[PDB]
C-alpha cells in the first residue's frame, strides 16, 4: 500500500512579468541602460528561454527603496530576508489551502508537514510559521528542508512517501515555496550567470497531500509514489552552486549543466527503474514531470531518451507560463498534466499512461527521480 498524492494546489505572487517586457524592465530599474553589451546578451537568452511570463513578488518600488539589491555585491541579505521570511510562508499558505480544499479532509487530520524553500532561512522556520497561519495541530511532525535547490521537488515526495508509509494513517502536507527576491542581483560582465537566472527564475508555491490507504468516498488519489532514487552526476560539482552571503544568495550556473544531464539521463533512468521492473528502453511509454531548469535541460532529456514530439508538453507548458520556480515546478507540472488529462478525457491523470517519473535536478549535480503510477480520473 504505497503512498499516494491525494491533492495538489499551487499559488504565485500577483505581479506578472511578460518576458517580452522583462529586458526593458530589468535594465531600466537597475540603472543599466548603458550596458548595451549586456542587453544584447540578455535579449538572446530571453529569446531562447522558452519562458513567456513569470510571477514575481519583487517590485520596482522595492528596488527603489533598497537599491543595494541591484548593486552587485553590496550588503543586502538582511532586507532580502526581512521580505522572504514573511512572504515564503504566506505564499505556501495559499497553495496549502488549495490542496487542503481538494483533499477534502479537516486540517486536524494532517499529521506531518514538510516545508521546503531555498529562498530564506530562519529559526523558528517556515514550517513553524505555516503551522501558525493554517492552524495545524501543534504536534504535527515537521521536516524543514532549507536550501536544497532544484532537485527537491522530487526529494520531498520521497520523504513524504517514507513518512506516510511508515506511520499508519499519516497525512503529510508538503509545501514548497520560492520567492526569488533573495537571488536577484545586478549586472556585471564578471558574473554573466546572473543573466541566465534573471531570464529564468520565478516565484511560486506548491502544496501536495500525501497519504497511504486513501479513505473511500472522501479521498481520491492522483498519483502513487512507487520508488525513488537520488544520485550525484560524476564530475559536475561546479554545475550549480549557491552561497548564502552578505550580498544575498549568490549563484553560479555552468553552461555544461544540460550536457551533464543529457550524458547521464539514460543511466539515471535505468538505475531508477531497476528498483521497479528493470525497464531500460522505450521511454515513450512513460509520462514525465521534468524539472525545467532551463530549456536546454528539457531538450537534452527529450533527445537522449528518444522522446517523441509532445511527450514533454506539460513540462514545457509550465516553463512557458511560469518559468523555473525551483522545487515546486515539478508539482505544477503534475497538476498541469492532471488538468490536461481531464480536458482530453484521458483514462488516467498521467496522460492516460500507467507509469511515469518526476526528475528533479539541482546542486551536485544531484538528480532525484520518483517513479509514479497514475490514477483513474474521478471526483
Ligand X SMILES: CC(C)(COP(=O)(O)OP(=O)(O)OC[C@H]1O[C@@H](n2cnc3c(N)ncnc32)[C@H](O)[C@@H]1OP(=O)(O)O)[C@@H](O)C(=O)NCCC(=O)NCCNC(=O)CSCc1cc(-c2ccccc2)on1
Can you say how many angstroms the Cα of residue 53 is from the centroid of all Cα atoms in its chain? 16
> Which of a copy of itself, ligand X, none does 243 bind, CB closer than 5 to 8 A by kind?
a copy of itself
- List 2, 31, 35, 41, residue binding ligand X (CB under 6 A): 41
Do 248 and 263 meet the contact criterion of CB atoms below 8 Å apart? no
Q: Does 152 bind ligand X (CB under 6 A)?
A: no
C-alpha cell at 8: 495538489
Q: Does 45 bind ligand X (CB under 6 A)?
A: yes
Taking the CA atoms of the chain, what radius of gyration do you get in angstroms? Answer: 20
| Residue 252: burial class (beta carbons within 10 Å; 0-12, 13-18, 19+) | middle
- CA dist 171 and 112 (Å) reads 6
> Which of a copy of itself, ligand X, none does 45 bind, CB closer than 5 to 8 A by kind?
ligand X
> Which of a copy of itself, ligand X, none does 324 bind, CB closer than 5 to 8 A by kind?
ligand X
Whose Cβ is closer to a copy of itself: residue 163's or residue 223's? Answer: 163
Q: Which residue has the cell 486513501?
A: 214
- CA dist 274 and 267 (Å) reads 11
What does 177-220 look like in DSSP terms, one character per residue? EE-GGGG-----TT-THHHHHHHHB--EEEEEEEESSPPTTT--
Q: Does 193 bind ligand X (CB under 6 A)?
A: yes
Whose Cβ is closer to a copy of itself: residue 124's or residue 310's? Answer: 124
Q: Cβ of residue 338: shortest distance to a copy of itself, in angstroms?
A: 26
Length of the chain in residues, anyone?
379
Can you say how many angstroms the Cα of residue 327 is from the centroid of all Cα atoms in its chain? 2
Q: Does 165 bind ligand X (CB under 6 A)?
A: no
> Which of ligand X, a copy of itself, none does 145 bind, CB closer than 5 to 8 A by kind?
a copy of itself
For the question of residue 150 being annotated catalytic, the response is yes
The secondary structure element, H or E, covering residue 129 is helix 126-134
C-alpha cell at 379: 471526483
- List 17, 115, 251, 273, residue binding ligand X (CB under 6 A): 251
Question: Active-site residue among 150, 176, 228, 379?
Answer: 150
- Contacting residues toward a copy of itself, per CB under 8 A: 75, 77-78, 81, 118, 121-125, 128, 131, 138-149, 158-159, 161-163, 165-167, 228-232, 234, 237, 240-246, 251, 271, 362-364, 366
Query: Interface residues with ligand X (CB under 6 A)?
Result: 41, 44-45, 48-49, 118, 123, 149-150, 178, 180, 183, 192-193, 196, 201-202, 240, 242, 251, 253-255, 257-258, 293-297, 324-326
Amino acid at each position: 500500500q504505497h503512498a499516494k498524492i491525494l491533492a495538489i494546489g499551487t499559488a504565485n505572487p500577483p505581479n506578472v512579468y511578460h518576458q517580452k517586457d522583462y529586458p526593458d524592465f530589468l535594465f531600466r530599474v537597475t540603472k543599466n541602460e548603458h550596458r548595451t553589451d549586456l542587453r544584447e546578451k540578455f535579449d538572446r537568452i530571453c529569446e531562447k528561454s522558452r519562458t513567456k511570463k513569470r510571477y514575481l513578488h519583487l517590485t520596482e518600488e522595492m528596488l527603489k527603496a533598497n537599491p543595494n539589491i541591484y548593486t552587485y555585491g553590496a550588503p543586502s541579505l538582511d532586507v532580502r530576508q526581512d521580505i522572504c521570511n514573511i512572504e515564503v510562508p504566506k505564499l505556501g499558505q495559499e497553495a496549502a489551502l488549495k490542496a487542503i480544499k481538494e483533499w477534502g479532509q479537516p486540517i486536524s487530520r494532517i499529521t506531518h508537514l514538510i516545508f521546503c524553500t531555498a529562498s530564506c532561512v530562519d529559526m523558528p522556520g517556515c514550517d513553524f510559521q505555516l503551522i501558525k497561519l493554517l492552524g495545524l495541530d501543534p504536534s504535527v511532525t515537521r521536516t524543514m528542508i532549507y536550501e536544497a535547490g532544484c532537485y527537491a521537488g522530487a526529494t520531498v515526495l520521497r520523504m513524504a512517501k517514507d513518512f506516510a508509509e511508515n506511520n499508519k494513517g499519516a497525512r503529510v502536507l508538503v509545501v514548497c515555496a520560492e520567492i526569488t527576491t533573495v537571488f536577484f542581483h545586478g549586472l556585471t560582465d564578471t558574473h554573466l550567470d546572473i543573466l541566465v537566472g534573471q531570464a529564468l527564475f520565478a516565484d511560486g508555491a506548491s502544496a501536495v497531500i500525501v497519504g497511504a490507504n486513501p479513505e473511500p468516498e472522501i479521498e481520491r488519489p492522483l498519483f502513487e509514489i512507487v520508488a525513488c532514487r537520488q544520485t550525484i552526476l560524476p564530475n559536475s560539482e561546479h554545475g550549480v552552486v549557491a552561497n548564502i552571503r552578505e550580498m544575498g544568495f549568490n549563484y553560479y550556473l555552468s553552461g555544461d549543466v544540460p550536457k551533464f544531464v543529457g550524458g547521464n539521463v539514460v543511466d539515471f533512468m535505468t538505475k531508477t527503474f531497476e528498483k521497479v521492473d528493470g525497464k531500460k528502453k522505450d521511454w515513450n511509454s512513460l509520462f514525465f514531470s521534468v524539472h525545467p531548469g532551463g530549456p536546454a535541460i528539457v531538450d537534452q532529456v527529450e533527445e537522449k531518451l528518444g522522446l517523441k514530439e509532445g511527450k514533454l508538453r506539460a513540462t514545457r507548458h509550465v516553463l512557458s507560463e511560469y518559468g523555473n520556480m525551483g522545487a515546486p515546478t515539478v508539482h505544477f507540472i503534475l497538476d498541469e498534466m492532471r488538468n490536461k488529462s481531464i480536458e482530453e478525457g484521458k483514462t488516467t491523470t498521467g496522460e492516460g499512461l500507467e507509469w511515469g517519473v518526476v526528475i528533479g535536478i539541482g546542486p551536485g549535480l544531484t538528480v532525484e527521480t520518483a517513479v509514479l503510477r497514475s490514477e483513474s480520473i474521478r471526483c
